[PDB]
């Protein structure tokens, strides 16, 4: 019953409970004439919530906050963007205006600025080298190395064994790595291997787009990217 574009009209947001205090948020995007669902994460921390990634753009992200208040009824106090592309930082201004403290690595913030995208307010230090990990409220942030982008982060929820990969992880039904304009195809399989090695106890893996599954999404991702590199 994980929602797809056939269940979410363009511009709508849904939540899906993955585990106690862990949800994905799913929003249908329209981009370059294609329509597709994008995932992010919500994690409970006491009586507050941590948000991972926006819903792409001001209107979608406002709709996300509305859906969270309806379904969960706890305030979002902090948000993290997993890389600099407009789909993951677009909407940060809505978050910030709503009182959410927004975060990203310094690399993500620089790249977003240089692109003319919205820029998270706060820097996350300690994530500049492959294998680097930092605790942030109820999650661990991990920099696996360059993959979909050079700055991409993944997020682990230790209490629930849930890994959110952002666009560095592909769904099982995927046959291509998607937009690779800012990707490092040579490094990406190695970066996935770091994730595999560091989180061998992950039970649920959530890709940037599409259906969650188990740890096999990681090996599948490496395989697709390697086959792409042809
Ligand atoms: Na969109
Ligand atoms: Na962008
Ligand atoms: Zn991207």
From TrEMBL:
<dbReference type="GO" id="GO:0008800">
    <property type="term" value="F:beta-lactamase activity"/>
</dbReference>
<comment type="subunit">
    <text>Monomer.</text>
</comment>
<dbReference type="InterPro" id="IPR050855">
    <property type="entry name" value="NDM-1-like"/>
</dbReference>
<keyword id="KW-0862">Zinc</keyword>
<comment type="function">
    <text>Class B beta-lactamase which confers resistance to the beta-lactam antibiotics, including penicillins, cephalosporins and carbapenems. Acts via hydrolysis of the beta-lactam ring. Has penicillin-, cephalosporin- and carbapenem-hydrolyzing activities.</text>
</comment>
<feature type="binding site">
    <location>
        <position position="87"/>
    </location>
    <ligand>
        <name>Zn(2+) 1</name>
    </ligand>
</feature>
<feature type="binding site">
    <location>
        <position position="87"/>
    </location>
    <ligand>
        <name>Zn(2+) 2</name>
    </ligand>
</feature>
<feature type="binding site">
    <location>
        <position position="167"/>
    </location>
    <ligand>
        <name>Zn(2+) 2</name>
    </ligand>
</feature>
<dbReference type="InterPro" id="IPR058044">
    <property type="entry name" value="VIM-1/2/7"/>
</dbReference>
<dbReference type="InterPro" id="IPR058199">
    <property type="entry name" value="BlaB//VIM/IMP-1"/>
</dbReference>
<dbReference type="InterPro" id="IPR001279">
    <property type="entry name" value="Metallo-B-lactamas"/>
</dbReference>
<feature type="binding site">
    <location>
        <position position="148"/>
    </location>
    <ligand>
        <name>Zn(2+) 1</name>
    </ligand>
</feature>
<feature type="binding site">
    <location>
        <position position="83"/>
    </location>
    <ligand>
        <name>Zn(2+) 1</name>
    </ligand>
</feature>
<dbReference type="Pfam" id="PF00753">
    <property type="entry name" value="Lactamase_B"/>
</dbReference>
<feature type="binding site">
    <location>
        <position position="209"/>
    </location>
    <ligand>
        <name>Zn(2+) 2</name>
    </ligand>
</feature>
<protein>
    <recommendedName>
        <fullName>beta-lactamase</fullName>
        <ecNumber>3.5.2.6</ecNumber>
    </recommendedName>
</protein>
<dbReference type="InterPro" id="IPR036866">
    <property type="entry name" value="RibonucZ/Hydroxyglut_hydro"/>
</dbReference>
<keyword id="KW-0479">Metal-binding</keyword>
<feature type="domain" description="Metallo-beta-lactamase">
    <location>
        <begin position="37"/>
        <end position="209"/>
    </location>
</feature>
<keyword id="KW-0732">Signal</keyword>
<dbReference type="GO" id="GO:0046677">
    <property type="term" value="P:response to antibiotic"/>
</dbReference>
<dbReference type="GO" id="GO:0017001">
    <property type="term" value="P:antibiotic catabolic process"/>
</dbReference>
<keyword id="KW-0378">Hydrolase</keyword>
<dbReference type="GO" id="GO:0046872">
    <property type="term" value="F:metal ion binding"/>
</dbReference>
<comment type="similarity">
    <text>Belongs to the metallo-beta-lactamase superfamily. Class-B beta-lactamase family.</text>
</comment>
<keyword id="KW-0614">Plasmid</keyword>
<dbReference type="InterPro" id="IPR049721">
    <property type="entry name" value="VIM-1/2_MBL"/>
</dbReference>
<feature type="binding site">
    <location>
        <position position="85"/>
    </location>
    <ligand>
        <name>Zn(2+) 1</name>
    </ligand>
</feature>
<keyword id="KW-0574">Periplasm</keyword>
<keyword id="KW-0046">Antibiotic resistance</keyword>
<dbReference type="GO" id="GO:0042597">
    <property type="term" value="C:periplasmic space"/>
</dbReference>
């Amino acid at each position: 019953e994980y929602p797809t574009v056939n269940e979410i009209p363009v511009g709508e947001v849904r939540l899906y409970q993955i585990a106690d205090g862990v949800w994905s948020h799913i929003a249908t995007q329209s981009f370059d004439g294609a329509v597709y669902p994008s995932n992010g994460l919500i994690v409970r921390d006491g009586d507050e919530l941590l948000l991972i990634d926006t819903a792409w753009g001001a209107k979608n992200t406002a709709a996300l906050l509305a859906e969270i208040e309806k379904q969960i009824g706890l305030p979002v106090t902090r948000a993290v963007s997993t890389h600099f592309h407009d789909d993951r930082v677009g909407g940060v201004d809505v978050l910030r205006a709503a009182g959410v403290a927004t975060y990203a690595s310094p690399s993500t913030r620089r790249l977003a600025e240089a692109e003319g995208n919205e820029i998270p307010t706060h820097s996350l230090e300690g994530l500049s080298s492959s294998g680097d990990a930092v605790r942030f409220g109820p999650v661990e942030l991990f920099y696996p190395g360059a993959a979909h982008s050079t700055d991409n982060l993944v997020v682990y929820v230790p209490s629930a064994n849930v890994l959110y990969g952002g666009c560095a992880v592909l769904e099982l039904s995927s046959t291509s790595a998607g937009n690779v304009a800012d990707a490092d195809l040579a490094e990406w399989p190695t970066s996935v291997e770091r994730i595999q090695k560091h989180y061998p106890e992950a039970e649920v893996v959530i890709p940037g787009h599409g259906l969650p599954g188990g740890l096999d999404l990681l090996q599948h991702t490496a395989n697709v990217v390697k086959a792409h590199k042809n």
